[PDB]
Symmetry: C3
Subunit: 253 residues, 3 copies
């Protein structure tokens, strides 16, 4: 059976260790994240086609104060160590969850959404439309009797590449700059990421500057172009992302 490294990532409190313990059972071990004493849990389970190494990522609300759990998930996410991500998403706080989701999706990392706590969503009287959600995100959405798990495993095997949906609608000025920023960036990172990194820099993401290399000192002269062409830049971006999530939610829940 083929090897596959999957990252497990989600918001804190959103059922991420439950999923990990059910998937790996006993075939798990605990180490520390390199250089720190933060715990790194790792595990293995078998799908029809793969033998999967599942790495439990620290629980987080955003990829971009700073935080160590945060620097860890992000650093790992940008490393390419992972062939694919299982994004555990709490159905009963769907909007706040999709924030992390969209980031993974604009990065372009092959992603399977594991939609949980669907019992609480019923009580609280929320219904998500699974497959409408899958169509807007561009990636399979699996609702979790060990059913969800089997369905989740199969999706890991069958899913290869998220659809390119251009999910956020940005001012054209903004994209022009994120792009001009993105060519000052290391060949070492894929295209979609360099775009995302370009946009993060225009948002005031300080952290991201350290991922940008050659594009640190071009933010000021990029902030040159936009002043003409526009602005409120970090404003337009946060907003665009906020409109994109608010509209999926109103369409699917």
């Amino acid at each position: 059976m083929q090897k596959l490294t999957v990252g497990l990532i989600g918001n804190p409190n959103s059922g991420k260790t439950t999923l990990f313990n059910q998937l790996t059972g006993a075939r798990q071990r605990v180490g520390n994240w390199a250089g720190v004493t933060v715990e790194r849990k790792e595990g293995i389970f078998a799908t029809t086609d793969h033998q999967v190494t599942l790495v439990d990522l620290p629980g987080t609300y955003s990829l971009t104060q700073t935080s160590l759990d945060e620097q860890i998930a992000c650093h790992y996410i940008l490393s390419g160590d992972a062939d694919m991500l299982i994004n555990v998403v709490d159905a009963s706080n769907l909007e706040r969850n999709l924030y992390l989701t969209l980031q993974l999706l604009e990065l372009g990392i092959p992603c399977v959404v594991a939609l949980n706590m669907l019992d609480i969503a019923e009580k609280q009287q929320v219904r998500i439309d699974i497959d409408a959600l899958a169509a807007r995100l561009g990636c399979p959405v699996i609702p979790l009797r060990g059913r969800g798990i089997e369905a989740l495993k199969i999706a890991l095997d069958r899913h290869q590449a998220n659809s390119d949906l251009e999910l956020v609608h940005y001012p054209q000025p903004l994209l022009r700059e994120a792009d001009l920023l993105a060519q000052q960036m290391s060949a070492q990172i894929p295209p979609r990421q360099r775009r995302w990194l370009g946009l993060q820099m225009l948002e005031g993401d300080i952290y991201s500057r350290a991922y940008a290399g050659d594009a640190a000192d071009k933010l000021d002269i990029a902030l040159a172009n936009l002043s003409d062409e526009i602005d409120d830049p970090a404003l337009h971006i946060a907003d665009a992302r906020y409109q994109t999530i608010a509209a999926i939610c109103d369409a699917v829940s």
Copy 2:
């Protein structure tokens, strides 16, 4: 920012002035429709890409007694003045609303559906499936905290062309004639419209004859062909449109 002329159209009582006042705020003015003393409200708002001139069309149940509100919406709709239409649709009377919708869709006018009064639909215990509705119509469907509006604006920018769905299933005889009628028609009107006009003439739409030009006096000899090949013609057509709406509704609500 780019200019874009959008028509606003819907059934009376279906929340069409509310939407118009929210979109344009104060940047509106009132004139009269050319040649009459019927009020024509016009307004402007800004999307990410466009500066939109919104023209409020008289409220109507059908494009095809006669009526002046009716002659006005239709005349404007066939003029091409409008780059795009926002079709305000009352969720709580979805079937009766889609009648106007289908007409716009068989005409081929780039169309964004604004699905409102979703509060009344809840109480009355109706749920519409937004994105299944969007897939059957071939055009974005936006459910309206100023959320819906932002989602509506973004769709105006992103939507270019309705999908060609062949939505109504017609007897082949019927289409043969609507088509033979449609070549007797002015180069000045697009293909989809000339087909629609051909069909309207076979339905007994008297009004449409004045849009047909050269194809007035061919209805009798078109009604020649169908007598052989079929009939009940105005019957088959009204019915086909009625089946098409009834099946979308049963599939999405």
Copy 3:
């Protein structure tokens, strides 16, 4: 009007004679299935494009003890007598119904699902999402005031070919053998069926061996290959089909 032979097939008790009596009214007659005294009801109704000969198939839970109702539906299904199938499916026992459905879909027979007893599903508090169901199955799904019937008729005309969805996710070893089995099989049966037949043989379907011809005595040496490569074979297959239905249901109901 064009001729079209449709088979009507479903589980017992799932409303299959009601649908048949409504579609054909009085234009029905009763005969016996060739060689037996089992009743074969046949009927005719008119669609917009076709004049349909509807043949009522014995009610059944599976295509693959043995049974005569069972041998009859299957034999007819593999004969190609039918240009298309109307699969009547009880919404209130959706999972148990889809078992028969999947078999038709892996065979590749142009299929229209007629989704009934939607009243009982409401009471029992089940909602099916029609068009999400249609998208996963690869075939139109029509929910049945003579509405459903009209919508059903139109779909018969418009539907030509199920989408190829590879619905069940099989171990690659399994498919390798079902395929090697499938070339030992008569040119007389289409590709998708010979694959299905290959898989049925590896499942312990005894009945299917008589459809396989030249591939009877290769099951033992096919069971050669898999022992190496795997196993639990009939296990993996039944399971794969069970996961596939369980995941559609969790996604659409």
